[PDB]
Every structure is written in structure tokens, then in C-alpha cells.
Design a binder for this molecule. Structure first.
Ligand SMILES: Nc1ncnc2c1ncn2[C@@H]1O[C@H](COP(=O)(O)OP(=O)(O)OP(=O)(O)OP(=O)(O)OP(=O)(O)OC[C@H]2O[C@@H](n3cnc4c(N)ncnc43)[C@H](O)[C@@H]2O)[C@@H](O)[C@H]1O
Ligand SMILES: [Mg+2]
Length: 211
């Protein structure tokens, strides 16, 4: 399957991606993960990305498109399918993606659009804790771990003032992107305001209705 998953920050893209990958075995491509990996390994791209990510701002499109395209162009994806998560995040990236996909002879089969009440998102991100090895996320109230602190951390961009900036930035950029793909008949709206397993149940029905 060739899929996009999108939603505002904290809407549960990563949480749902993990469950999607477990069942459908698509390749998870998360720009967020790629940036954070670059940072932790102190690559050049990591140093530049940090200055944006620490502020809750979008990383420039050219760097973002390039790394996505690099991933999309590799030999795996043709036969395994992917789940693009956190990209495209600007309409420019959407156009870049579409061109890139056409060149490669790859077609999007669906967009999973997780809709969540924006009033829920500050709390989702403020309570997030992250398992180090897997990057699996938990929530101290809504989805607590079975704890041991050495195994967890909190994302730098999850401090409330950064979250508030992230939300503003992405509420403005997300509307033209969803419309772009809805116009192509590719958008599936998911009720994100449920338990994690109920959200997944909805997504699973969508994915087993494709193709
Ligand atoms: N294409 C791009 N172009 C330019 N710049 C880019 C870019 N991509 C990334 N960047 C830059 O990198 C930065 C980070 O990007 P990125 O990592 O992609 O962040 P994001 O899109 O804001 O998404 P998050 O990981 O913060 O939220 P999520 O929806 O995956 O939530 P989760 O599943 O963990 O869940 C959140 C919390 O809620 C809990 N939770 C999940 N579901 C539920 C539920 N139903 N009920 C209750 N709690 C829930 C979870 O346990 C967790 O605690 C960007 O801000 C930007 O600077
Ligand atoms: Mg995520």
C-alpha cells in the first residue's frame, strides 16, 4: 500500500502508524523521525533542522523534499509500499511529492486524515513520554507505560510554548494540502477523538477497503 497519514500535531499519527506497520507491513517514512535521527547523530542536516524544530517551525522544503525523495526513490518501496507520516506539510511539498511519485510510477492509494479536536492537542503533547529504543510514545494519563525513567524521555519540542507555535503553524498549512488530495478522491477522514484501539479499528476498515 502507498499511503499518507496526516493530522495536526498530537493527533496520533505516530501511534496509528505503529499499528498500521504491524499489520500491513508498509514502510514507515516519518520526516519527524528522520530529522530527530539526523540531530542525534549530529549530521549537517541535523544541525540546520534543529534550529527550526526547536522553535516549532517548519524545516525548509528543499531539504525536506530531498530526504523524502531519497527515501521514495530507493528500490524497496516499489514492492513493499509506504506510509508517509508528517509529509507533505506544505502545498509546495505536496506538488513536489506528486511529481516525484509520477516519475517513479507510484500512485497514492489513500490518505488517512486523522481529525482531532484542536482543544485536545496541548494536553496530548504535554503528557507525552517516549520510549528510547523504539520511539514508541505513551501518555502519562491516556496511555501510560507498564515505568523506569532510564528507558524514557520527553521531546524538546513538546514544551507548551513550542507546542503552541507548532499548532498555529500547522493549522494554516494543512487546509490546502488536505483539499488538494480530497479533490483527487484520496482522502479518508478518521475520527481521532476516540480510544487508540477504536481509532485504529476505523483506519483498518478503510485500509481493507482499498484497491
Ligand atoms: N514535512 C515536514 N516539513 C517541514 N518540517 C517538518 C516536516 N516534518 C517534520 N518537520 C519538522 O519536525 C518537527 C516535528 O515533526 P513531527 O515529528 O512529524 O511532529 P508532528 O507532526 O507535530 O506530530 P507529533 O509526533 O508531535 O504527533 P503525533 O500525531 O505523531 O502524536 P503521537 O502519535 O505521538 O501521540 C501524541 C500523544 O498523544 C497520545 N495519544 C495518541 N493517540 C491518543 C488517543 N486516541 N487518545 C489519547 N491519547 C492519545 C499519545 O500516547 C502521545 O502521548 C516539525 O514540527 C517540523 O519542525
Ligand atoms: Mg509523530
Amino acid at each position: 500500500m502507498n499511503l499518507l497519514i496526516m493530522g495536526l500535531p498530537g493527533a496520533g499519527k505516530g501511534t496509528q502508524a505503529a499499528k498500521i506497520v504491524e499489520q500491513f507491513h508498509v514502510a514507515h517514512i516519518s520526516t519527524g523521525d528522520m530529522f530527530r535521527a539526523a540531530m542525534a547523530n549530529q549530521t549537517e542536516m541535523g544541525v540546520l533542522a534543529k534550529s527550526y524544530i526547536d522553535k516549532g517551525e517548519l524545516v525548509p522544503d528543499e531539504v525536506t523534499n530531498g530526504i523524502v525523495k531519497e527515501r521514495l526513490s530507493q528500490d524497496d518501496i516499489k514492492e513493499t509500499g509506504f506510509l508517509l507520516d508528517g509529509y507533505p506539510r506544505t502545498i509546495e511539498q505536496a506538488h513536489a511529492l506528486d511529481k516525484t511519485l509520477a516519475e517513479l510510477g507510484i500512485e497514492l492509494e489513500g490518505i488517512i486524515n486523522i481529525e482531532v479536536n484542536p482543544d485536545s492537542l496541548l494536553e496530548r503533547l504535554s503528557g507525552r513520554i517516549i520510549h528510547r529504543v523504539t520511539g514508541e510514545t505513551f501518555h502519562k494519563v491516556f496511555n501510560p507505560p507498564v515505568y523506569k525513567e532510564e528507558d524514557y524521555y520527553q521531546r524538546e519540542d513538546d514544551k507548551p510554548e513550542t507546542v503552541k507555535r507548532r499548532l498555529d503553524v500547522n493549522i494554516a498549512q494543512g487546509e490546502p494540502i488536505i483539499a488538494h488530495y480530497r479533490a483527487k478522491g484520496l482522502v479518508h477522514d478518521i475520527e481521532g477523538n476516540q480510544d487508540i484501539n477504536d481509532v485504529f479499528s476505523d483506519i483498518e476498515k478503510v485500509l481493507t477497503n482499498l484497491k
